[PDB]
């Protein structure tokens, strides 16, 4: 069997572009394409794609469950077995749902978080997508309640592979291949297992300090918001950032992070009360 | 002396398949478990008869840790793409080796924990098991991260403790296989290559373990002599040969010397029609 793959993504906006490639027998060979269970019935009147199939202007008619067969000349049938199925989902057909993290977007390493997708539009199903991932979107049925439709995606136990940017989509009962416009992105950040910083008042500023070479420090108050400062080396091989105190609140926590790992933060420092 | 090793390979192959993770486990030269992310089992599988008595708790626990590794090292391919600024379209390889050595008494001697990216050394736990060797600039970032997570302390505790305790348990459970020594069965072959010269070949077959020394000498002095890599016979034993080209009429001058854990005394082979 061949390997079928959509590039760049099997989730594609109307007007975007996606190319179906059919790797059969060590080359992207000549192949035919098949939709749904019609695997002995090739689409587009039996066209023999020569390299790839680029559907440059994607329409809702492009949506579907595809299979390819590579050309096999010294075979009884001349063609390969049926490939893996690839489901092309076209987006932008409804107005975007909303996506929210419960209890919040900072998730401790080893714990779970709920990514709740919701909308005032009565969506039958919801689709959760981590940006950049080739895997199929997770699918859930939309629970209807008090005039809102909603679905709870459970993510966890939290590791760095699950952190990043998420978007969710809706579909209607009669148009599953047709998805809504994508929701606004939600950044999920895993904290730890990097050792927590120290947070203290300058013997005024709030200092985040660690022997660990964090390159950025993040300050967070219990109310919510986000202040970031670059780490500076000094005072005994310590990497520290001094945050200007300001010239009326308390209970702050600090995290360290490294460059090229934006969604991976240390365990939080102990809570510090600022009078 | 005995050794335990895990070898894992993660490959990206955009357009040719989904990223694939394969891990294999060895005790000395005997493979005993494997995991393949491209399989419907998605479980860690036995590969030697003596490990198949381990209970379901073993197979549940091991599958959990190796599937976790599968997810972790597959994500490490996307991180390496960022560290090195490499295209999403390229194929890349990420390899890991882990394990410990134990002596005859059953005690720790050395531990290992190493990675490579695209065939070149990436990061490695040093010999003392406390610090990291970063090969380039990307690996310095991982080193700084792993110092912050105290990874060396956890692997050190695992390599000196749980790894060694497991090897010790495996060696007793598969003793008759893992602590066997099958001595080399030897033979020599003479083939004329010309009017003035002939090839003398010393053959070693049916040997376990696979550590062996095949050496040729003329009149007693070492003659460094073609030497093939030791190869698996496919039944758990190994094969090797050494060949030298000899002047016609001087075959009696040459001797082949065999050293192996299964031979109480080193073998001396001499040609004889």
């Amino acid at each position: 069997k061949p390997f079928l793959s959509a590039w760049p993504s099997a989730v594609v906006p109307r007007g975007g572009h996606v190319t179906l490639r059919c790797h059969y027998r060590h080359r992207f060979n000549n192949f035919m394409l098949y939709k749904e269970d019609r695997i002995h019935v090739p689409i587009f009147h039996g066209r023999l794609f020569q390299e790839s199939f680029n559907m440059s202007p994607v329409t809702t008619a492009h949506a579907g469950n595809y299979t390819c067969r590579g050309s096999h000349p010294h075979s009884p049938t001349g063609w390969s077995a049926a490939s893996n199925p690839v489901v092309i989902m076209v987006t932008g057909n409804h107005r975007k749902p909303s996506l929210l993290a419960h209890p919040g977007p900072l998730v401790k390493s080893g714990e779970r978080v709920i990514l709740q997708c919701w909308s005032d539009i009565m969506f039958e199903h919801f689709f959760l997508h981590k940006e950049g991932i080739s895997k199929d979107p997770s699918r859930l049925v939309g629970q209807i309640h008090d005039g809102v439709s909603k679905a709870n995606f459970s993510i966890g136990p939290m590791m760095f592979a699950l952190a990043g940017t998420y978007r969710c989509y809706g579909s209607v009962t009669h148009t599953p291949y047709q998805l809504s416009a994508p929701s606004d992105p939600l950044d999920i950040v895993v904290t730890g297992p990097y050792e927590k910083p120290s947070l203290s008042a300058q013997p005024v500023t709030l200092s985040c300090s660690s022997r660990s070479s964090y390159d950025m420090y993040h300050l967070s108050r219990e109310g919510g918001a986000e202040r970031r400062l670059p780490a500076v080396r000094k005072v005994n091989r310590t990497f520290q950032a001094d945050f200007p105190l300001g010239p009326h609140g308390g209970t702050y926590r600090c995290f360290g992070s490294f460059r090229h790992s934006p969604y991976e933060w240390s365990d939080p420092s102990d809570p510090l009360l600022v009078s | 002396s005995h050794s335990m090793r895990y070898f894992s390979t993660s490959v990206s192959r955009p357009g040719r398949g989904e990223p694939r993770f394969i891990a294999v486990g060895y005790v000395d030269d005997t493979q005993f478990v494997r995991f393949d992310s491209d399989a419907a089992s998605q479980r860690m599988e036995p590969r030697a008869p003596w490990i198949e008595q381990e209970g379901p708790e073993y197979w549940d626990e091991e599958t959990g840790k190796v599937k976790a590794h599968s997810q972790t090292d597959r994500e490490n391919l996307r991180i390496a793409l960022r560290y090195y600024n490499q295209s999403e379209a390229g194929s890349h390889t990420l390899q890991m080796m882990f394990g410990c050595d134990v002596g005859s008494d059953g005690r720790f001697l050395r531990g290992y924990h190493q990675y490579a990216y695209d065939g070149k050394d990436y990061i490695a736990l040093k010999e003392d098991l406390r610090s990291w060797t970063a090969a380039d600039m990307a690996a310095q970032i991982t080193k700084r991260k792993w110092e912050a997570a105290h990874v060396a302390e956890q692997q050190r505790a695992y390599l000196e403790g749980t790894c060694v305790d497991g090897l010790r348990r495996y060696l007793e459970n598969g003793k008759e296989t893992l602590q066997r020594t099958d001595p080399p069965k030897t033979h020599m072959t003479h083939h004329p290559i010309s009017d003035h010269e002939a090839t003398l070949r010393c053959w070693a077959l049916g040997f376990y373990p696979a550590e062996i020394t095949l050496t040729w000498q003329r009149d007693g002095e070492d003659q460094t002599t073609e030497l093939v890599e030791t190869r698996p016979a496919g039944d758990g034993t190994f094969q090797k040969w050494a060949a030298v080209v000899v002047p016609s009429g001087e075959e009696q001058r040459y001797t082949c010397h065999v050293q192996h854990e299964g031979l109480p005394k080193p073998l001396t082979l001499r040609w004889e029609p």
């Binding site: - | 190796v66 390496a80 924990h113 997570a149 956890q154 692997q155």
Partner: peptide, 8 residues
């Protein structure tokens, strides 16, 4: 026994 593994 299989080791615990960490991200890059």
């Amino acid at each position: 026994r299989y080791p615990l593994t960490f991200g890059w």
